[PDB]
Amino acid sequence: RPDYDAVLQDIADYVLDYRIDSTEALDTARNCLMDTLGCGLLALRFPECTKHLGPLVEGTLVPHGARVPGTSFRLDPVKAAWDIGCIVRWLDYNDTWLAAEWGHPSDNLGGILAVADHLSQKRLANGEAPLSMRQVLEAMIMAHEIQGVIALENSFNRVGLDHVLLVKVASTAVCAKLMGADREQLLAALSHAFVDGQALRTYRHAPNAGSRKSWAAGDATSRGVRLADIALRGEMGIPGVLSAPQWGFYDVLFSHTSKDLATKPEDKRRFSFPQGYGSYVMENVLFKISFPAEFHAQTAAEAAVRLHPLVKDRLQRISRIVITTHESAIRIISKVGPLANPADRDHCLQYMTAVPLIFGDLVAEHYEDAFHAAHPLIDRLREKMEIVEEPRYSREYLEADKRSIANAVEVFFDDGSSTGQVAVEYPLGHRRRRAEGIPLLQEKFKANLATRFPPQRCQRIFDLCSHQASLEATPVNRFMDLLAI
Amino acid sequence: RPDYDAVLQDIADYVLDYRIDSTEALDTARNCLMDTLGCGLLALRFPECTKHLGPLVEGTLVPHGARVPGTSFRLDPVKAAWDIGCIVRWLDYNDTWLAAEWGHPSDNLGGILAVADHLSQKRLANGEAPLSMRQVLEAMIMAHEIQGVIALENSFNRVGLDHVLLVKVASTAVCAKLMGADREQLLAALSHAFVDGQALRTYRHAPNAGSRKSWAAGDATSRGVRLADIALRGEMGIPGVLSAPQWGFYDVLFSHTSKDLATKPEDKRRFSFPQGYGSYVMENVLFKISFPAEFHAQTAAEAAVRLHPLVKDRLQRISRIVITTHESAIRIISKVGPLANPADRDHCLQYMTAVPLIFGDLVAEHYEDAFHAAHPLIDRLREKMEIVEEPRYSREYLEADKRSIANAVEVFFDDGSSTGQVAVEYPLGHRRRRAEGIPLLQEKFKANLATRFPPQRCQRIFDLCSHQASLEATPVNRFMDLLAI
To answer: Locate the MmgE/PrpD C-terminal domain: which residues (chains A, B) (predicted)?
Structure first.
């Protein structure tokens, strides 16, 4: 019987022994928590979301049960994790990680919060200390790292699998540690997350797309709670889950590309890593805090809004519009021709640049059919647009020290005049612009709070969340009381 | 947005519209119910099994909760289906279907009983009539049919996936029916079973095998209950889940053999069927009622107990033992050389032929290293055992009018004489020996009941299960009452 594959061991040793010493990671983890909870609160206005929430059997009584913020539910950790994971991801406004695999590592808050809430209450009733919110922040940082770092070079999308398996893996490990797993239990849990069935991503792709794109994450972090619980009950592990021949994850599920059914070269049938596990992912995570736009177009629309006062007058006089960009924006979001659905304008670099040049703003209303086929000047600006890749933009898109998403917009006029090239290399949600965006993230948190809580409670919630040292010192159960109903 | 894939529509129209009036199907389903429940009761003596049972949070109260037979547990139907499916499969004594895919369709009783128990109670508490056991028998027949008919020609271990996904699909189907689903809800439920993740089978193969081989099924019927309930909450479906290019089940998971990572010829990249759905599987299902041995050797062990009085005192005169068998037994349980643990001996045709040849019997005690060593004659005879494939046996193993599992044994002596050749082509648990097998199935139920209930309760349970018409008219909640504690 082999020992555990090393990928599982390296996660295990990280989760158990790594000491987070980055105060920036702790800071932005705190802001992630606020941002993520606000997203969840807002989703409670959407009955296609809320129809999933609550106990499986009405009237069920769970001692010391975990709370779902914004509700009165008290559930076992496994269903509370499902519910929280569900609401914080539902509207696709939560944090993002863009790499070989795309993902939303804040989704892991479902498992973290539900397990830590339940366990503080249980320990309190036994005369022991509760867990502190400091420990949920550390759990988030590690969940981010595990998911984000595996995603740096490993794409599940290309083998036809949803990215939600990283949520399941990361949640299993971080929830196993919150439950007090030792090394052998932790490794056992990780092997069950990899032997587990992994969801297809069929529900993310037309003509079969659907609202499971919104709850796959919560269902994954929930399953991570359940796999940790199983390992804590003492279940044995599967040591060669990844490497085993014929039967292992690598041969069965990571050895063929979905587009063509081709076998991968042997050197590519494993996970590969350019770095270890630290606190890189939380430090460099993207927040959605400006224009509602695909991230590759975020800096393009910011330049177009600034360019507005030099094009607002005589938009007809516009002759040439040049959008200099990075290559992935050209691959994923550059589109020519008719924009039929609101999903097509969502994914058109020219559409999302024409609207803020004309109106000085890009809001979610500007994608509805009645708007596009009402202002033909959008299509007029759109045919005038030339998109040129900048080598430097595309390379520093990949450079680990930079991780740019850079766009530059220059509008020319029929007389030969131009405005000059407004270049924006980093979107407002980026690490480089934290001093700028963190106030926007906070006003977005205050607005999300106000859709669920009265002003008295809103201020009390914000004040605690604004105070790092007081937040960290707060028991998880006392933090969760603030969030109920 | 396409219609649902034809496979899903065929399953749904069968589940909603097919009327079950087959007298033999309903009689063997009632014997199937006894045998399955008695198997699960026996598992309660095994802490590795019982460590998985009960609520996730100790002390949880579930109004109208489903019961787990042989325990005092009262759970939601998802956890209840997990525990029932876990316990009835744990010891690998429950019924079997051998085809392109092997399986144990009785695993679906976990989802069927938990849903039908909870729903009867909840309906009683709102003044509605409860479900009857006739409905659980019909749900078993349908679940047996969906799983066992897909397994006729579609092998999932050749693509490196556990067969348990057929438990999830069938349990999803019949539980959605019991919950009252209409056609659009049942289609959506079915589509979520296929888009779901499908476990690897690493845990069934050395050197990684472990006890998840015992609870994978309970985990799969539990997941089926959960997805059925997701569909009844109105969640939209995924219509081209199987046939979608690139993202569908066929392209991602059914397109490669895991031996060699070789792509299948195009025409075989989908499920094939030799017939439609009816009541075929349950009528031809296999019960384990004779010796405790791997199915491919039950007629071998039988042919040896017959040969035992003719050799019982000439053991040192045996010079050649010829075992004429079928192609699957040779491949799966023909093992020369040392046998480390009981699992080896459990899956070694020569062992399960030699022991009965010597001691006129075969029980679990014989798979003990202590018993093995105590008698060196086992290996003397194992080394004299010539295994030969009969082409007929292998063909009739496959033909749908027969489903033979055949073993002929012949014993030769140093002086050149021999016994005859004793051929047993059908094991006792086969449809062709229903008459003789049913006495043994009932005695096996009676013994297993007696490891858990005192004699008068054992009598009430046996007497009720004995009478087809009485059992069928019994409310599910009252049947489950008898099985508590």
So the answer is: 291-467
